[PDB]
Amino acid sequence: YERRAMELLKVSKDKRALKFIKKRVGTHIRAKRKREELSSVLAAMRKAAAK
Amino acid sequence: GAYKYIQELWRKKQSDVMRFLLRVRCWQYRQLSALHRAPRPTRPDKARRLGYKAKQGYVIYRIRVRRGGRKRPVPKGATYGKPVHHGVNQLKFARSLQSVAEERAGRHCGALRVLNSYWVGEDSTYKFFEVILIDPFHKAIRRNPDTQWITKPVHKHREMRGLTSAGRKSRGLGKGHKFHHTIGGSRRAAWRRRNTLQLHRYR
Amino acid sequence: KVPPAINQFTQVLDRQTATQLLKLAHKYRPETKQEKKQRLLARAEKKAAKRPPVLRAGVNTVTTLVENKKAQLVVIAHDVDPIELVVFLPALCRKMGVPYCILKGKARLGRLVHRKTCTTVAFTQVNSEDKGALAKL
Amino acid sequence: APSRNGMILKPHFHKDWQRRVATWFNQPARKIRRRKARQARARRIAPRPAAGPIRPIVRCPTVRYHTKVRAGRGFSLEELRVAGIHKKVARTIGISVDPRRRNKSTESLQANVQRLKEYRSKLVLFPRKPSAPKKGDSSAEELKLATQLTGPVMPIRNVFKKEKARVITEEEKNFKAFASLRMARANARLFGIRAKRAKEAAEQDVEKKK
RNA sequence: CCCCCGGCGCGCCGGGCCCGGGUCUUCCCGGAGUCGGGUUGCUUGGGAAUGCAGCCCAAAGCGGGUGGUAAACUCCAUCU
RNA sequence: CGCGACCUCAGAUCAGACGUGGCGACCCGCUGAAUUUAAGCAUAUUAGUCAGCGGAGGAAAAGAAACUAACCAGGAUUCCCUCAGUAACGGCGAGUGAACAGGGAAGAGCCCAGCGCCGAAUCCCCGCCCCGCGGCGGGGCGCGGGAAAUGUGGCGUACGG
DSSP states (O other): OHHHHHHHHHTTOHHHHHHHHHHHHOSHHHHHHHHHHHHHHHHHHHHHHHO | OOHHHHHTTTTOTTSHHHHHHHHHHHHHHTTSOSEEEESSOSSHHHHHHHTOOOSTTEEEEEEEEEOSOOOOOOGGGOOOSOTTSOOOSSOOOSSOHHHHHHHHHHHHTTTSEEEEOOEEEEOSSEEEEEEEEEOTTOHHHHSSGGGTTTTSGGGSOHHHHTOSHHHHHHTTOOSSSTTGGGOSSSHHHHHHHHSOEEEOSOO | OOOHHHHTTTSOOOSHHHHHHHHHHTTSOOOOHHHHHHHHHHHHHHHHOOOOOOOEESHHHHHHHHHTTOOSEEEEESOOSSGGGTTHHHHHHHHHTOOEEEESOSTTTTTTTTSSOOSEEEEOOOOSSSSHHHHOO | OOOSSOOOOOOOOOSOGGGGEEEOTTHHHHHHHHHHHHHHHHHHSTTSOTTOSBOOEEEOOTTTSTTOEEEOSOBOHHHHHTTTOOHHHHGGGTBOBOTTOOOSSSHHHHHHHHHHHHHHHHOOOOOSBTTBOOTTSOOGGGTTTOOOOOSOSSOOOOOOOOOOOOOOOHHHHHOOHHHHHHHHHHHHHTHHHHHHHTTHHHHHHHHHHO
């Protein structure tokens, strides 16, 4: 479900991605907490792709 | 050591390394018998956290427990009563399947004494656990002062009174406002003390 | 499709270099119950009138000193029943820059010590003559 | 069917209460056994007090009793850490400890360490071995003055301060106590909406200029 | 008056026994198909679900649980 | 193909141990009704109650907070008094129905895994010595056998270490 979520991150459908994880992991605070972590590793993938 | 490295791995059940290795043992146990002995713990980090000490006298049994819920044993429904008690199909059991797993091993292996069990694999039709038994009459267990509490006769058949971690979960006892209906010793004890009349001497 | 973090355990070291490394490891074997007994009678007799570098068996000994970067070579067994006990360690020494080799069979690896099985053996330090013997390995 | 007038009774006697009637004929017999065991516990640790270890001064919650003082369960560590006595030593000489307690105030903390200093003054310590007086022991002449203390040792008393007669000031005559209450009852209740209405003033100011 | 029985210390020996507190510097520290969410059934005084379980989803770490009206944000308190 | 480990898994009238079963007044885990009441009755009540099932002990269970509170805060459990027939539940009908605070009786706290540190520094059994031996125990001697590195013993548990 996380690899399905990063596709929503690269198309940046964040309002739908949060709803996607909330129906997966549970309450809003957990779905919030995981969400910024997953764009932080995409940016950690985006920092290596350039150089 | 390396146990903490194993600890955070087993919390990654959805990962491909675990999704593979879980389905191997789940396939492997499903070809075995319903009740048999394993030589060594397949899940060692969860063993020692529950009290498993690798020495002579610690024997573990890996069993399979049928998935699902419980249905009421009555012919064609046969609940000659009110519409409240006609419910026969969607009923659920009180004790957890992990506590039923410690029963079937403890009852059959009545020579040993149950300590703890843990999850090792799941299927749509079965539910596998590895219970950690203990031998009450080996001197390696008898002579260590930390584990001679097992041999006392009140620790016979902890799986029949529910004194295990799986056993303490299903009784619903604990501290707080949420467990008011079991203040005292038991859910039977709370109800008993709440429904007697204290006929004093001078009233 | 075996996942590659455990597929890496059929990708094992060859025949002839396993001979030399165990020959290199047939020189740092641990003190037995006798070689401890013949150690303690030697230190107790000097009571009336420093240790050489030895190996480390078991993952609980190894994974500590790799984090302290004290190891110079790691020997691995490939056929543990809970493969999860080893799976992290090749991907760990890569991040720790510690050279690791995998060996087929834990029993022949279990006879470096006088026990049945050994999952992991470490080379933390060596003798003075045994320096070019590992630097080529 | 009720009579002309009465009350409405809901007597919870619809179960089978007859089977679960616990009568109290043990009470004169229970007090016999209890005091006998209370005397056996007395003579078993005879020089130590029958009341057991000391209980600290404790305030009680739930504002109906928040002006009262109880007997505590045990002295907190921050009550004993500044006392100069380690927690695994105070159990040997009759000081009850429980580590879960806090001291958010200071006046209770200082009053209890006052109670331990005077308890340490009263404490007649035997030697470990009869032939040698150790450094922290009591002297020999105090051993004859060592007997059993009945009753709770250093009993907690909810005493109060006397207030001398004083002349009333002029501000106190102009002091409107009840009018201060309803003004303060407004201030505590309408604190949120006054915090909110203070925020939109700024945005309706900045768009006027910008 | 006579046995039995333990208790209590007192002396002999085989013994294992080197352990504490305070200042400062610097490292370490926690339990997972479980918490939790969904839904169904039972139970509870527990009432937009107290407790128990079955099934699906499935954790996090200045996090988590609780703070008796659902939810969002904001502070706290409070345990682990 | 011979051999040697190991890994699994059998089989013994193998060496030595251990479990069944009875009582069940009191205790613990499940299961679990209906007569009864509501002037009928189906929710409810009866009631987590009898009948059934398991396993105990001379006590059991529970128990050292993922606690109560909202204070100037208390501080494991169990038991009595009070809270109180109260908050609350309920064809809001019938009925049902706790907890905190306070006063008592009692009073008691601690071990692991993990974390690392100790050269596995630990343990069973057989051979032997002494000493007691109707609780087969201690001490020492055995390149005696074995367990254990897929982790024993020591240090150490949230009050910090």
